[PDB]
Design a binder for these strands. Sequence first.
RNA 1: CAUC
Length: 150
Amino acid sequence: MQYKLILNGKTLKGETTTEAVDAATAEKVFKQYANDNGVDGEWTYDDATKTFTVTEGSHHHHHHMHRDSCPLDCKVYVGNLGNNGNKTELERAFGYYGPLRSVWVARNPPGFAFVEFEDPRDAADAVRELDGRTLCGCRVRVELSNGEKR
RNA sequence: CAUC
């Protein structure tokens, strides 16, 4: 019986078919043809239209409509926290919403500090649920850090 | 939004 395959990639994309028994032969035929175009992403199958797919993430190229919202932008600010310069509380508070990359706190009876996350969405979620309330024992103004010029 |  014949089966289909789609090679959804950034630049090289396409589709083909083959005579097989089922996935037990189609899943060891398309593996060659896909690598001959050069795709080798998410190996998929549809059990109602009998059509494989391989949505690319292996030919080492991708871009879309993003720039000033990347892993570089993840720096954050926190202040009016309460008298604490030990980082541990705010560090687990930050990394709780999602993994950090760096944390800083000052030297003179502080209640003010700085932070950097790994995903800019970890910083965004943290900023959205750490602000204007309380964390250590104060009112926590929490913002993205303005401390850059590219 | 710096006390590094």
